Every structure is written in structure tokens, then in C-alpha cells.
PDB file of C-alpha atoms in Angstrom:
ATOM      1  CA  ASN A 539       0.069  -0.098   0.087  1.00 30.80           C
ATOM      2  CA  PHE A 540       3.073   2.183  -0.828  1.00 30.85           C
ATOM      3  CA  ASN A 541       3.340   6.021  -2.308  1.00 28.33           C
ATOM      4  CA  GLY A 542       1.574   4.729  -5.546  1.00 30.25           C
ATOM      5  CA  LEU A 543       2.757   1.319  -6.292  1.00 27.36           C
ATOM      6  CA  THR A 544       0.444  -1.205  -4.501  1.00 29.52           C
ATOM      7  CA  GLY A 545       2.853  -3.942  -5.960  1.00 30.42           C
ATOM      8  CA  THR A 546       3.280  -7.755  -4.520  1.00 34.18           C
ATOM      9  CA  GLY A 547       6.984  -8.957  -4.389  1.00 31.27           C
ATOM     10  CA  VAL A 548       9.390  -9.966  -2.758  1.00 31.88           C
ATOM     11  CA  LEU A 549      11.090  -6.635  -2.474  1.00 34.14           C
ATOM     12  CA  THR A 550      15.024  -7.137  -1.196  1.00 34.07           C
ATOM     13  CA  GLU A 551      17.212  -4.329  -1.907  1.00 39.28           C
ATOM     14  CA  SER A 552      18.641  -2.249  -4.834  1.00 41.68           C
ATOM     15  CA  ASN A 553      22.468  -1.701  -4.934  1.00 41.91           C
ATOM     16  CA  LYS A 554      22.028   0.016  -8.155  1.00 40.04           C
ATOM     17  CA  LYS A 555      23.780   3.956  -7.894  1.00 38.71           C
ATOM     18  CA  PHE A 556      20.384   5.358  -8.895  1.00 41.00           C
ATOM     19  CA  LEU A 557      19.997   9.105  -9.472  1.00 39.55           C
ATOM     20  CA  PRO A 558      18.713  11.170  -6.385  1.00 38.87           C
ATOM     21  CA  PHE A 559      15.633  12.774  -7.634  1.00 40.10           C
ATOM     22  CA  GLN A 560      14.080   9.577  -9.027  1.00 38.45           C
ATOM     23  CA  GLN A 561      11.388   7.282  -7.457  1.00 40.57           C
ATOM     24  CA  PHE A 562      10.072   4.358  -9.649  1.00 40.52           C
ATOM     25  CA  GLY A 563      12.062   2.370 -11.894  1.00 40.68           C
ATOM     26  CA  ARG A 564      11.323   1.466 -15.691  1.00 42.10           C
ATOM     27  CA  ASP A 565      12.198  -1.197 -18.420  1.00 39.82           C
ATOM     28  CA  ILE A 566      11.920  -1.821 -21.627  1.00 40.47           C
ATOM     29  CA  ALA A 567       8.321  -3.353 -21.051  1.00 39.55           C
ATOM     30  CA  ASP A 568       7.353  -0.404 -19.001  1.00 41.54           C
ATOM     31  CA  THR A 569       7.121  -2.266 -15.616  1.00 42.47           C
ATOM     32  CA  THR A 570       7.996  -0.635 -12.524  1.00 41.79           C
ATOM     33  CA  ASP A 571      11.057  -1.961 -10.814  1.00 40.94           C
ATOM     34  CA  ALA A 572      11.836   0.631  -8.291  1.00 41.19           C
ATOM     35  CA  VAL A 573      10.102   2.175  -4.656  1.00 41.56           C
ATOM     36  CA  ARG A 574      11.169   5.307  -2.934  1.00 42.49           C
ATOM     37  CA  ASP A 575      10.885   4.414   0.576  1.00 44.73           C
ATOM     38  CA  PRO A 576       9.507   7.038   2.870  1.00 47.03           C
ATOM     39  CA  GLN A 577      12.035   6.770   5.914  1.00 44.49           C
ATOM     40  CA  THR A 578      15.188   5.573   4.815  1.00 47.30           C
ATOM     41  CA  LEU A 579      14.989   7.131   1.244  1.00 47.76           C
ATOM     42  CA  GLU A 580      16.575   4.090   0.019  1.00 48.29           C
ATOM     43  CA  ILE A 581      15.208   2.265  -3.195  1.00 50.34           C
ATOM     44  CA  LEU A 582      13.271  -1.107  -3.598  1.00 50.65           C
ATOM     45  CA  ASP A 583      13.192  -3.450  -6.285  1.00 49.11           C
ATOM     46  CA  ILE A 584      10.170  -5.213  -7.493  1.00 48.43           C
ATOM     47  CA  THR A 585      10.308  -8.656  -8.298  1.00 48.84           C
ATOM     48  CA  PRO A 586       7.094 -10.804  -8.894  1.00 47.42           C
ATOM     49  CA  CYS A 587       6.383 -14.405  -7.590  1.00 47.93           C
TER      50      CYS A 587
ATOM     51  CA  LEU B 846      17.361  -8.340 -19.944  1.00 49.40           C
ATOM     52  CA  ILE B 847      13.965  -8.697 -22.231  1.00 51.10           C
ATOM     53  CA  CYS B 848      14.583 -12.933 -22.097  1.00 56.20           C
ATOM     54  CA  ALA B 849      14.529 -12.424 -18.125  1.00 56.25           C
ATOM     55  CA  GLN B 850      11.498 -10.244 -18.191  1.00 58.23           C
ATOM     56  CA  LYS B 851       8.694 -12.459 -20.127  1.00 59.52           C
ATOM     57  CA  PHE B 852       7.143 -13.180 -17.111  1.00 59.66           C
ATOM     58  CA  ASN B 853       3.844 -12.038 -18.378  1.00 59.15           C
ATOM     59  CA  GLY B 854       2.468 -15.937 -19.512  1.00 61.31           C
ATOM     60  CA  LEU B 855       4.781 -16.183 -22.897  1.00 62.11           C
ATOM     61  CA  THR B 856       7.048 -18.445 -22.458  1.00 60.42           C
ATOM     62  CA  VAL B 857       9.581 -20.419 -24.633  1.00 61.76           C
ATOM     63  CA  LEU B 858       9.222 -24.780 -25.191  1.00 59.57           C
ATOM     64  CA  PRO B 859      12.756 -26.679 -25.529  1.00 59.30           C
ATOM     65  CA  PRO B 860      12.821 -28.857 -28.732  1.00 57.84           C
ATOM     66  CA  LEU B 861      12.347 -33.051 -28.435  1.00 56.26           C
ATOM     67  CA  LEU B 862      15.710 -33.694 -30.427  1.00 57.07           C
ATOM     68  CA  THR B 863      18.671 -32.408 -28.979  1.00 57.56           C
ATOM     69  CA  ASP B 864      21.556 -31.196 -31.145  1.00 53.24           C
ATOM     70  CA  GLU B 865      23.631 -33.862 -30.121  1.00 55.59           C
ATOM     71  CA  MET B 866      20.975 -36.372 -31.762  1.00 53.17           C
ATOM     72  CA  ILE B 867      21.030 -34.401 -34.650  1.00 50.15           C
ATOM     73  CA  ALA B 868      24.641 -34.483 -35.060  1.00 47.20           C
ATOM     74  CA  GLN B 869      24.703 -38.364 -34.408  1.00 45.34           C
ATOM     75  CA  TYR B 870      21.960 -38.678 -37.907  1.00 45.86           C
ATOM     76  CA  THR B 871      24.211 -36.779 -39.899  1.00 48.71           C
ATOM     77  CA  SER B 872      27.242 -38.609 -39.056  1.00 48.07           C
ATOM     78  CA  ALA B 873      25.149 -41.850 -39.747  1.00 47.75           C
ATOM     79  CA  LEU B 874      24.235 -40.632 -42.986  1.00 48.89           C
ATOM     80  CA  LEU B 875      27.562 -39.655 -43.709  1.00 52.86           C
ATOM     81  CA  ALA B 876      29.242 -43.131 -43.290  1.00 52.95           C
ATOM     82  CA  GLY B 877      25.966 -45.098 -45.277  1.00 50.78           C
ATOM     83  CA  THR B 878      26.367 -42.222 -48.343  1.00 50.19           C
ATOM     84  CA  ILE B 879      30.352 -42.680 -48.045  1.00 51.14           C
ATOM     85  CA  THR B 880      30.447 -46.519 -47.405  1.00 52.81           C
TER      86      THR B 880
END
């Protein structure tokens, strides 16, 4: 029930050097793969079942 | 990355005959047609 994702995954961590003011990741198929963390500002990593 | 992205329901099935068996068939034909 996040800030605009409402996803369902096994999100662990993102080790990529993401740009500061960028929250929602995308790919070649226009699929969300990143979440801005409201507290630690740590980007997560969407991954399905 | 796209090959690992197709989790929307689209898959690829492997062929029944492995290449190492097609090679055996080709070798058998070559031996038969040369001997």
C-alpha cells in the first residue's frame, strides 16, 4: 500500500547507483521495478512471485 | 534482460531432439553414403 505502487513482490534491496530525485524504475516493457522508501529513502526492487 | 522479463505468461519450449542427436543422425547418413 505504498506511495503509488500497490505492488506484490519479494522486494529485498537495490544496489544500483540510482539518481537522487528519481523514485519509480522502469524497463523496456514499462514495468515498475523501484520504490522510494518514505523513511530511509532507500530504493527497493520489485520482483514477482 | 528481455529474455528474463517475459514473466507475463509467454514462454519458450525446448525442442524434443537435442543437437547432439541431430549430429549423430548426420554422421550416420555421411557414413552410409560414403561407405
